């Protein structure tokens, strides 16, 4: 694959540091280091490839660049020269911060409302008020709902008080918030991943760690057990969903997993069978005894894997 980002990357690794420095100063740290690694280790070089890269650069120069004067590269310096020639007020610099602020406001709208809230909860309530006013109404309502009641009411009250609509101080406020997400994204919290990791573990060790974390913190252990939970009760799992998964899942696999599963689980899973399938499954459960628990757990894990596959499809909310 060669995306528009990747085409520019190939251009850079082909041309050299003379334009790479300008690209870096107009670029971001991770892509700078990616091109540095590309320079350190390169195996995408070919006699035709390099010429095609030059042709693609010429296309960018005649289209994306349109053979124009430096775009905000040397122009910003002449803009600063005009600013210096005019009153001693760096409005252009304030506009630069506003540009990042407006882009950050759009990013804030894109990114998760609760993460935005907890990144702004520590900040000033007036900061929260003005940023919520300047944000999209839908994103603002999402963050409002994700706020606690008292903080939310204070934010709306200070929104009502907010009339100063200030002017360059607002831009640097957003810049500080962006810098508090500018740091490496991380997001390795994996609130689901503990649960996911324990599910990936063996079932007996899963139960042992569940008991251990119940001793550690009933709250955290209960959250982990909830993350273990996958189609255990019909009302939360949704019958239509039990209907859709289990026709995709092999009937024999469901049977083997059910005869090792609890009778409530058997009943709630068979309630979404075609009646012939439910009767056949129950009759075979009566016929054959509990097969090896290893095979029963294998069928249960296959059921969970198909649940995860349909979660990947995203047509309905699993449990």
């Amino acid at each position: 694959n060669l995306s528009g980002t990747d085409k520019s990357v190939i251009l850079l690794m082909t041309i050299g540091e003379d334009r790479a420095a300008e690209v870096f100063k107009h670029l971001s740290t991770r892509e700078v280091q990616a091109l540095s690694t590309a320079m350190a280790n390169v195996r995408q070089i070919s006699n035709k490839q390099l010429t095609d890269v030059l042709s693609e650069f010429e296309q960018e120069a005649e289209q994306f660049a349109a053979l124009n004067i430096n775009a905000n590269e040397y122009l910003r310096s002449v803009l600063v020269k005009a600013l210096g020639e005019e009153r001693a007020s760096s409005l252009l610099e304030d506009i630069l911060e506003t540009r990042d602020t407006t882009s950050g406001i759009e990013t804030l709208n894109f990114m998760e409302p609760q993460s935005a809230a907890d990144l702004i909860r520590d900040e000033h309530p007036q900061i929260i008020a003005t940023i919520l006013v300047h944000l999209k109404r839908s994103q603002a309502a999402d963050i409002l709902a994700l706020f606690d009641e008292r903080l939310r009411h204070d934010v709306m009250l200070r929104i009502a008080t907010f009339g100063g609509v200030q002017l360059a101080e607002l831009t640097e406020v957003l810049n500080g918030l962006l810098d508090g997400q500018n740091l490496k994204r991380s997001k390795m919290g994996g609130v689901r991943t503990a649960a996911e990791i324990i599910n990936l573990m063996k079932t007996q060790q899963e139960e042992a760690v569940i008991t251990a974390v119940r001793e550690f913190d009933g709250e955290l252990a209960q959250k982990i057990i909830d993350e273990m939970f996958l189609f255990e009760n019909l009302v939360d799992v949704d019958d239509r969903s039990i209907q859709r998964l289990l026709q995709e899942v092999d009937s024999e696999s469901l049977l083997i997993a059910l005869k090792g599963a609890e009778p409530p689980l058997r009943e709630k899973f068979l309630r979404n069978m075609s009646q012939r399938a439910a009767d056949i499954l129950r009759d075979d459960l009566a016929n054959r005894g509990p097969v090896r628990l290893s095979q029963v757990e294998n069928e249960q894990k296959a059921i969970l894997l198909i649940v995860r596959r349909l979660a990947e499809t995203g047509e309905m909310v699993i449990g």
């Binding site: 006699n47 035709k48 390099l50 660049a65 430096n70």
Partner: protein, 47 residues
């Protein structure tokens, strides 16, 4: 494999063409440095 040797000679000619293309890229970096910076910004935006 005389044809393969001819293809290798063509590849060497292509390599000389690639060096000329690299020189043309160097010339684009050299003349109109402003335009080179503008194209840098344009490629970054397209990225």
């Amino acid at each position: 494999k005389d044809e393969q040797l001819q293809q290798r000679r063509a590849n060497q000619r292509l390599g000389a063409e690639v060096m000329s293309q690299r020189i043309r890229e160097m010339s684009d970096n050299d003349p109109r440095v402003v335009a080179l910076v503008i194209r840098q910004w344009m490629s970054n935006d397209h990225e």
